[PDB]
Structure 1
C-alpha cells in the first residue's frame, strides 16, 4: 500500500514541506498565524507542499486517512471575532480565489460562496448570504461555504481546540471529532465521495479570512496526518 505520513509539532519559515499562501506568518513560538490583523479582507492559507494521491484511475481505489490538528482563535480589541478556519482538500494547483473578499468565503470560495474543495470549517460569524446557522458552527463543505451539514459549536477566545478527522474510503464517510477547552466533544459526519468531487492528486491545508470589521487571531499549532491507498 501507498502511505503518506507527517507530523508537525511546530512550524517554521523556509520549511519546504509547507506552502504559504497570502497573509500567513510563522510566530517565534512555532505557531502559524493565518490572517493579518491590520489588513482589510485578509486571507492566509497553508498547504502540505507534496500533492497527495487520494485516488487512482487505474485501480479505482480511494485512500483512507487519519488526521489530527490543534488550533486557536483569539479575539482582538474592537473588531468582530471573524471569520474562522477551514481544514480543506483541493486540486494540487489550488490558490486563494482571484479577487477574494475574504470574510465568509474563508479564503476558499468566490463571492457567491462557490469553489473547488472539500473542507471542515470552524465558522465564527453567521453569513446569511451563505445560509449560515445563527450560532458558531462546525461545517462539512463540498465545493461551497453553504455547508452540506453543520453542527452548533462555540469558539472560545484563547482556547486550544483539538480536532481528529477520519475518512473511511469504503463508506466514503468523513467523520470529525472536536475537543473543546471545557472538555466536551462535538462531532459531525457526512458521506463525501472524494473520487467524484476531487482529482486524483490534491493538496491538504488550512485557510482563514477576515473582513474590514471582522478580524481575529487564527492560529494553527500542530498537525499530524496519515493516508493509506491500497495499490492492487
Structure 2
C-alpha cells in the first residue's frame, strides 16, 4: 500500500522537507521555536512540505497513521504562559489566517475560532470566547478551536512532553497519549471522519501563538510519522 514516513531528531532551517510559516525559527540546538517572544500576537507554524494522501476518492479508503512527537513549553518573565501548541492536519495549501490575532486561535483559525483543519491541541490558557475549560487541557479540534472534546491536563514549564497519536481508519478513531514529566499519562480519544472533514491531500504540522500579554516558549524537539493507505 501507499506509505509515507519520516523521522526528525532535530530540525534545521534550510531543509526543503519542511515549510516554515510565521515567526518560526530554528534554534542552534535543532529545536523548532514556534513563536517570537518579542512580537505581539505572534504566530509560527511548521509543516511537513510533502502533502500526504489520507484518502482515495477511487477506493473510498482512508489512511491510518501513527505519529509521535516531543515538545516543551517554558514560562518567560512578565508574561502569561499562553496559549499553546497544536498538532494539526489541513488542506495542502494551508496558511496562517489573514489578519490572524494569534492568541486563542492557536494560529489555525479566524477570530470566531473557525478554520479548515483537524487536530490535537495543548491549550495553556482558558478562552471563554471559545468555550475553553477552566484549566490547561488537551482537546480534539475539528474545524474550530472550540474543541469537540477536552481532557484536563497540566503544562509544566521547562518539562519535555511526549505525545503519541494513533488513527485507526476502520473505526475512524483518533486516540492520543500524553506522557507528562512525572510519568503520568493523559489520554483522549474521539471518532473523527477524516474523509468528510478534509480533502484528499493534506499537510501535517504544528502551530503556536501568543498575544500582547500572553507569551511563552513553544518548542518541537522531535517528530516521527508514518501513515499507510490501502490502495486496493
Instruction: Kindly state the Cα deviation for residue 189 of structure 1 after the two structures are TM-superposed.
Output: 0.1
* Counterpart Cα distance in 1 of 2:139 and 2:84: 11
Instruction: Kindly state the Cα deviation for residue 5 of structure 1 after the two structures are TM-superposed.
Output: 0.6
Instruction: Kindly state the Cα deviation for residue 20 of structure 1 after the two structures are TM-superposed.
Output: 0.1
Deviation string, structure 1 residues 53-92 (Cα, Å, up to 9, x no partner): 0000010010000000000000000000001000000000
Deviation string, structure 1 residues 124-172 (Cα, Å, up to 9, x no partner): 0000000000000000000000000000000000000000000000000
TM-score, normalisation: structure 2: 1.00
* Counterpart Cα distance in 1 of 2:222 and 2:141: 22
TM-score, normalisation: structure 1: 1.00
Q: Could you say what secondary structure the match of 2:177 adopts?
A: strand
* Counterpart Cα distance in 2 of 1:97 and 1:216: 21
Say how many residue pairs are matched.
Answer: 232
* Counterpart Cα distance in 1 of 2:60 and 2:193: 12
* Counterpart Cα distance in 1 of 2:13 and 2:41: 23
Structure 1's unaligned 5+ residue stretches are none
Q: Could you say what secondary structure the match of 1:79 adopts?
A: coil
**Which consecutive aligned stretches of 4+ in structure 1 deviate over 6 angstroms post-superposition?**
none
Q: Could you say what secondary structure the match of 1:138 adopts?
A: strand
Q: Could you say what secondary structure the match of 1:195 adopts?
A: helix
* Counterpart Cα distance in 1 of 2:146 and 2:13: 33
Structure 2's unaligned 5+ residue stretches are none
